[PDB]
Structure 1
Amino acid sequence: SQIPASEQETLVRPKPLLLKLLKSVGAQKDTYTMKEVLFYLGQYIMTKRLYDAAQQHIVYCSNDLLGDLFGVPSFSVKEHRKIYTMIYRNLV
């Protein structure tokens, strides 16, 4: 959408705690495409109900490993470059 397709399709190696998160929702490898990392992050967010009906575009990740990894208590799913940057902080 806001992120170039080529950037989305690149192979990445998560750092250990990001890998822990992905493994907790069924991921079974050491390397992923960015798009794959984003999918499993999505499944994690939905599993842990890190959302709210009053603000439907906001991930509420405070007091959660995702919050610790991203360094924020919440963020908007519309901020695609900001999300990519938060993910790059968690890649080898």
Structure 2
Amino acid sequence: QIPASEQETLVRPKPLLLKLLKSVGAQKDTYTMKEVLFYLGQYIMTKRLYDEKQQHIVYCSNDLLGDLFGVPSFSVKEHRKIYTMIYRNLVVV
């Protein structure tokens, strides 16, 4: 459904997203989506907003991530929706 070439595209996170990304990776002016997805994913795991015990759902209503995505929770398996939420927070280069 989602082509792998999409992970090579270049983007610039908006201020709030950049704040989240910097807690897990070095600050950069331009990121590849592969980088954005990893840092976002790593932020979710280190903060345990995703417990492998709780059937694929990430709970973020008590986190900045919830403010970024505009939702209290979401499934890690519904990738199309994740991309749409992430793009609301970045600008394509």
TM-score, normalised by the number of residues in structure 1: 0.90
Please, which runs of 5 or more residues in structure 2 have no aligned partner?
A: none
| Structure 2 partner of 1:22 | 21
- Write the distance in 2 (CA, Å) between the matches of 1:30 and 1:19: 10
C-alpha displacement at 1:74, in angstroms?
0.5
Residues 38-65 of structure 1: per-residue CA shift (max 9 Å, x gap)? 0000110011110235423111111211
User: Equivalents in 1 of 2:66, 2:40: separation in Å?
Assistant: 12
User: Structure 1: where are the runs of 5+ without partners?
Assistant: none
Q: What is the root-mean-square deviation of aligned Cα atoms in Å?
A: 1.5
Q: Show the counterpart of 1:51.
A: 50
Report SS of the residue matched to 1:37.
Answer: helix
Give the superposition deviation at 1:24: 1.0
More off after superposition, 76-85 vs 47-56? 47-56
Distance in 2 (alpha carbons) for counterparts of 1:87 and 1:52 = 21
Q: How many residues align?
A: 91
Shift of 1:66: 0.5
